[PDB]
Design a protein around this ligand. Sequence first.
Ligand code: 5NE
Ligand code: 5NE
Ligand code: 5NE
Ligand code: 5NE
Lengths: 125, 125, 125, 125
Amino acid sequence: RLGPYVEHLGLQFERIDPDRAVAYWSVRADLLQPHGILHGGVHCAVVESVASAAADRWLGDRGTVVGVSNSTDFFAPATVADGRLTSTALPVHRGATQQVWSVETVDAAGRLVARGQVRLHNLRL
Amino acid sequence: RLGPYVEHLGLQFERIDPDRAVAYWSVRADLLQPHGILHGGVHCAVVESVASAAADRWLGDRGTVVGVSNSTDFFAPATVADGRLTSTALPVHRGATQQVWSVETVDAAGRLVARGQVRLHNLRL
Amino acid sequence: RLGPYVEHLGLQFERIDPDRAVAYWSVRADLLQPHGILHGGVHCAVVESVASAAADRWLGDRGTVVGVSNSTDFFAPATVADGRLTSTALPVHRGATQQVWSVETVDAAGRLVARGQVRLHNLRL
Amino acid sequence: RLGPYVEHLGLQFERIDPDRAVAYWSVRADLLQPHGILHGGVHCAVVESVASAAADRWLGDRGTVVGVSNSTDFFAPATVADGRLTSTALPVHRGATQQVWSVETVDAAGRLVARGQVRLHNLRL
Ligand SMILES: Cc1cccc2c(C(=O)O)cccc12
Ligand SMILES: Cc1cccc2c(C(=O)O)cccc12
Ligand SMILES: Cc1cccc2c(C(=O)O)cccc12
Ligand SMILES: Cc1cccc2c(C(=O)O)cccc12
């Protein structure tokens, strides 16, 4: 129940709690930019996906969230050879009107591949 | 020659110059998050695509660019009903090692839907 | 009527309109970091000052603004030798609850020294 | 040995290690914006100060660092009444050419007042 774009990214969630979300995924040939590494927009969309899932789960029955902004840094190039990536969203602030979550994407060795912050607005019932 | 992820986004470039890139696209049902609006990661990936295309074209035969970071703000929700979006990348700084580009995504009425900055690193021959 | 920190920065405003603010200032020895160039935080505070002044002026009698976030890029080192800097704030979005402004700091030659975006929240009467 | 602007901020460092820096400070009347809360630029400058100190200490004899960009979020208003703030810088990435550090400013109760990321460039000998 995360939408069609999340499915196309290939994210597979191990956990979506009010205080953490974890998802596994992989570089795929269709996700590349012309020099054979991951298109940077894919990192941003993964960061957006894992944070908004957690933010939505935290808000729960009390309303719904809308994305406000996303700032993602790319620290290493990623290819199909780099295997399974893990993206973990952790909360920075969870308040009445705003949420900010931090998402780290790491490889199996724990090497930080990307890291992003997502700001969300709470639409409360 | 922009890679498979750019094609999947549906971007169609009117212009890729050393100082500006313009691309048209549209919200599509496969690009949505669960509440029927555009997945925010799609805005980030579009911003990344149009800026990196321009940055790569500016660097030209002198080398190649790698994405460093992307910060995109979402100002209005976007649906299939909102029609054709236009994303324009304009340069902020184009130097020896770094480039920063600003990308605005607007609807046909000129309403600002999203806006992002992309930092790139120059890999020079 | 901009507060004591703005005065300590040495900002001198030529213009504070609902759609633009302009201020002149200069690197000073007390504003430096240990290697003799401008402390980067000074760029951020100048960006915050010129944008919030404009945002507050735009909101006018209808309420007041509070800073939400600030993202500033530093493109060139600045010293006392670099003379008079000009910081211009231009609006990106001015809505019901949020404002986003973009501020460019340039030297006399038009060389871009720094550039920042400031997000503000509208506290409406 | 941190420069005159750091002194004017009133930062007092408990720790500057290659992997963490901690500094205490306080809102002061001269640091305010016109509505009696901390000028947001002060948060950015504190974030810049504590991260660059740590980054410089990590690089050590091998070279020196220059600020590249700073993104700070303000989560609560801060006044003189809020007492002693603690700013802690932790490393996100420390590589050959780039460093990224994350800085959290909290009050005595552990309430998150501000949080910023600083990107630095390594000038290596
Ligand atoms: C053409 C090109 C070069 C370098 C990078 C890119 C990216 C990217 O930054 O991920 C995305 C799309 C196209 C790119
Ligand atoms: C589940 C959910 C709620 C609200 C927003 C989202 C987004 C988004 O922020 O675009 C992306 C993916 C899932 C979302
Ligand atoms: C010690 C040091 C080195 C390099 C940079 C700095 C900065 C700065 O980034 O402006 C601020 C404060 C201290 C610094
Ligand atoms: C005039 C005004 C209103 C609201 C906020 C500010 C700030 C600030 O954003 O900290 C800085 C300088 C002036 C301000």
